[PDB]
């Protein structure tokens, strides 16, 4: 069970950015993908979720109108699209597994397994 | 089959417990009943798993007729009977494998449901409700054999009962 | 196998004819008491005077059953063996039906000495079904069934 | 096993239900039990159910001696074997099937208690005693899979226990 | 399963009961298991307990070639396709018999579960507690299928739930 | 499952009729049978039902005396016999098998399924 | 591989008005073999194959 990457991106100033995260070792249908940005020095912010099987996706309210989550099942690669670059979204993409924690008929938390390797993407002129 | 699905997350064993309570979820699986299973499997694959030497010709390079044909019916009827023989046993050898671990599945639900006595109820998916304060070292000891019902059970049957 | 099968050694005797030849011959390797005897269920034909002649019998089925003959083929020691029992230098016994026939050609050579004789029978047996008929014809080296089984 | 006997009344399932309320009785089927034994047993029966051309002589119009008693003895022996397959198959499939049956009806049952919780108790006898109201709807809520054992838990409990 | 050990005092039959009451302890079988136990293992027995007369030569005493050795061939063949079907068929026939008899042990032990209903629990060795005076007559009755529930339902409930 | 009944008979008054009705397709004697009077122009009377292993029998306090039905397990037919004829006996005579519902240990109603022809007696001088 | 076969002079029954018999032979001859057939007498040819 591991997740693959893209390599990293020198983008310029408003601007869009895809980052691409491929699924090997299970049913990449069958689990959710979260994507986390980790500024340089700064803590996790988690952006938003994408459901393989469905297509729905679910957002924060701070992201809102700036990304967009695809899927391809194909090749088992989940996509992040984010517009309106600025100097600001220069950090560490990370595109993580949701496992959730099934007890019977209700779920109770989880945790974030396997972790990808992350990405670098760079906003400068 | 009252159990809906497995758990892809418990790579430590076969079958195993989770559990939630007023500090969190865990997970912990069973050792006795996996080493049962395992036991059994490897019994049943040790014997699955002859020595001629000088035996009749196979293949022949001319017609001949009586004797030929009678070379090459003997060894198709040995090797369509040992098919058959093969695929019975796997069949068989199959059938009782999924049978031996549902069974052994049914043990440990059992087992537990047998161990909380009247201090639990069993919701139906193939797990139970504790109707009392149930902390970690509450969990362990239903799992290890050592657990203890007279010590709940009276906040366990005014919780079950009166409301 | 076709005798132990059959579960019967019942031999009936039957008025085969052999004209011109000499019947009930006998060896010393089958002492049958003090005198020299021979198998029971078979004739050993030989020279009678100085001539062998061509021996052609028939024998039909007008039973309902089937019947086996065994007949043998003598393989004498020498040549003058041969010709001191058959005329013929070389002899030969063919016994047919209508569906099958079987010629024997007799061998001369020294085997090794067995029962103080150094020559060979080669017993052969024949099958006659209901309809069927058995005719024996040799020119000479013909030990000649008495019967059958 | 604890039922007793079939009914010759049910034509429309293999297993089902029967009930008495102040309405009066009703019987109707299950399907999802019905229709797991109809393909338990049709996934076994295409499996029960070979191409030589040409082959040895096997019926003889003479007496000719080893190779006609060679032949007639691989006959016998090929005969004898398949004989012997055939009967265990049949045997061991039957068993299956009445086992497989079985298990069918007792998976029914033990779904059905424990979908009424604390609000039946088990007359042994296949049937249970709904202590409580249960009207036309309320079967067909414990039929088709969604009973709601809360709803009634006060009155079933305040009928079981206290008198 | 539940029950651990077997009892070596019982020589009067496979399967039984042991008590311990008021007036003392006691033990007894019951021959309706026993009996149907015995039925199917001497059934099973009368299944597994052929005239062939001329055969082909199994033993020679001369090098011939091509006959000789398909004859073995053929024989060796033979025997080892029937030591194959030995081996199975007493495998097979082991298997159920155990699990046959451990069916009968557990079929006795939830018919007395659901002759007791609400007045006795289970305490996980096989064995049960009763909640109420149950005199020797009472065992009996509970042995022989005659127990009524309803007259010992108020105190087994009262010493149940209210301490 | 059909009950076949025998034919019309036109007996004399002051005398008895036997009806026949003959089983096929259910073991006959695992059901009760049960023989209905349907009088020309009015509703069905019940009669009685004979207890087709140990051929007990219980009939209607009104033909008490009168009615006396017998089985036949050999060739699975139920026979009715009602003596005294009388005019008001002309009617349509069935055989109808009781089916018992049972809930378990006990019993709680039925129906009658199936029934015969019916034969149609006659009284008259 | 080779046949050589003997005739031998007898009185077989009388069939269809023959005493005398005619036993039947056969011979295979692979790609790239030759038939030679050699008689001093009694031979019944072939007049091609199969």
Same mark, same amino acid.
């Given at each position: 069970?591991?997740?693959?990457?893209?390599?990293?991106?020198?983008?310029?100033?408003?601007?869009?950015?895809?980052?691409?995260?491929?699924?090997?070792?299970?049913?990449?249908?069958?689990?959710?993908?979260?994507?986390?940005?980790?500024?340089?020095?700064?803590?996790?912010?988690?952006?938003?979720?994408?459901?393989?099987?469905?297509?729905?996706?679910?957002?924060?309210?701070?992201?809102?109108?700036?990304?967009?989550?695809?899927?391809?099942?194909?090749?088992?690669?989940?996509?992040?699209?984010?517009?309106?670059?600025?100097?600001?979204?220069?950090?560490?993409?990370?595109?993580?597994?949701?496992?959730?924690?099934?007890?019977?008929?209700?779920?109770?938390?989880?945790?974030?397994?396997?972790?990808?390797?992350?990405?670098?993407?760079?906003?400068?002129? | 089959?009252?159990?809906?699905?497995?758990?892809?997350?418990?790579?430590?064993?076969?079958?195993?417990?989770?559990?939630?309570?007023?500090?969190?979820?865990?997970?912990?699986?069973?050792?006795?009943?996996?080493?049962?299973?395992?036991?059994?499997?490897?019994?049943?694959?040790?014997?699955?798993?002859?020595?001629?030497?000088?035996?009749?010709?196979?293949?022949?390079?001319?017609?001949?007729?009586?004797?030929?044909?009678?070379?090459?019916?003997?060894?198709?009827?040995?090797?369509?009977?040992?098919?058959?023989?093969?695929?019975?046993?796997?069949?068989?050898?199959?059938?009782?494998?999924?049978?031996?671990?549902?069974?052994?599945?049914?043990?440990?639900?059992?087992?537990?449901?047998?161990?909380?006595?009247?201090?639990?109820?069993?919701?139906?998916?193939?797990?139970?409700?504790?109707?009392?304060?149930?902390?970690?070292?509450?969990?362990?000891?239903?799992?290890?054999?050592?657990?203890?019902?007279?010590?709940?059970?009276?906040?366990?049957?005014?919780?079950?009962?009166?409301? | 196998?076709?005798?132990?099968?059959?579960?019967?050694?019942?031999?009936?005797?039957?008025?085969?004819?052999?004209?011109?030849?000499?019947?009930?011959?006998?060896?010393? =390797?089958?002492? *049958?008491?003090?005198? !020299?005897?021979?198998? +029971?269920?078979?004739?050993?034909?030989?020279?009678? &005077? /100085?001539?062998?002649?061509?021996?052609?019998?028939?024998?039909?089925?007008?039973?309902?059953?089937?019947?086996?003959?065994?007949?043998?083929?003598?393989?004498?020691?020498?040549?003058?063996?041969?010709?001191?029992?058959?005329?013929? =230098?070389?002899? *030969?016994?063919?016994? !047919?039906?209508?569906? +099958?026939?079987?010629?024997?050609?007799?061998?001369? &050579? /020294?085997?090794?000495?067995?029962?103080?004789?150094?020559?060979?029978?080669?017993?052969?047996?024949?099958?006659?079904?209901?309809?069927?008929?058995?005719?024996?014809?040799?020119?000479?080296?013909?030990?000649?069934?008495?019967?059958?089984?």
């Amino acid at each position: 069970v591991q997740l693959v990457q893209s390599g990293a991106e020198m983008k310029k100033p408003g601007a869009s950015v895809k980052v691409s995260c491929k699924a090997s070792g299970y049913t990449f249908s069958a689990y959710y993908i979260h994507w986390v940005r980790q500024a340089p020095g700064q803590g996790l912010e988690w952006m938003g979720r994408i459901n393989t099987d469905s297509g729905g996706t679910n957002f924060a309210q701070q992201f809102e109108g700036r990304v967009t989550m695809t899927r391809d099942t194909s090749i088992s690669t989940a996509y992040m699209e984010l517009s309106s670059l600025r100097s600001d979204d220069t950090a560490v993409y990370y595109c993580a597994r949701g496992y959730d924690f099934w007890l019977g008929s209700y779920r109770a938390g989880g945790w974030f397994d396997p972790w990808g390797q992350g990405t670098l993407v760079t906003v400068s002129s | 089959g009252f159990i809906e699905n497995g758990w892809e997350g418990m790579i430590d064993g076969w079958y195993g417990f989770r559990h939630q309570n007023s500090e969190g979820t865990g997970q912990a699986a069973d050792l006795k009943s996996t080493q049962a299973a395992i036991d059994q499997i490897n019994g049943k694959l040790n014997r699955v798993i002859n020595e001629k030497f000088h035996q009749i010709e196979k293949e022949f390079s001319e017609v001949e007729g009586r004797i030929q044909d009678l070379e090459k019916y003997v060894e198709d009827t040995k090797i369509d009977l040992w098919s058959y023989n093969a695929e019975l046993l796997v069949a068989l050898e199959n059938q009782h494998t999924i049978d031996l671990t549902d069974s052994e599945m049914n043990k440990l639900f059992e087992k537990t449901r047998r161990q909380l006595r009247e201090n639990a109820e069993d919701m139906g998916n193939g797990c139970f409700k504790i109707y009392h304060k149930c902390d970690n070292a509450c969990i362990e000891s239903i799992r290890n054999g050592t657990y203890d019902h007279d010590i709940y059970r009276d906040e366990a049957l005014n919780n079950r009962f009166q409301i | 196998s076709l005798v132990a099968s059959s579960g019967t050694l019942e031999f009936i005797t039957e008025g085969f004819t052999w004209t011109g030849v000499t019947q009930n011959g006998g060896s010393n =390797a089958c002492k *049958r008491g003090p005198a !020299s005897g021979f198998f +029971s269920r078979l004739n050993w034909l030989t020279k009678s &005077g /100085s001539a062998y002649p061509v021996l052609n019998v028939t024998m039909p089925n007008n039973d309902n059953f089937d019947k086996l003959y065994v007949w043998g083929v003598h393989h004498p020691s020498t040549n003058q063996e041969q010709t001191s029992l058959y005329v013929q =230098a070389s002899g *030969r016994v063919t016994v !047919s039906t209508r569906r +099958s026939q079987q010629t024997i050609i007799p061998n001369i &050579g /020294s085997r090794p000495w067995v029962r103080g004789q150094s020559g060979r029978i080669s017993i052969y047996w024949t099958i006659v079904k209901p309809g069927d008929v058995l005719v024996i014809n040799s020119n000479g080296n013909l030990i000649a069934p008495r019967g059958y089984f």
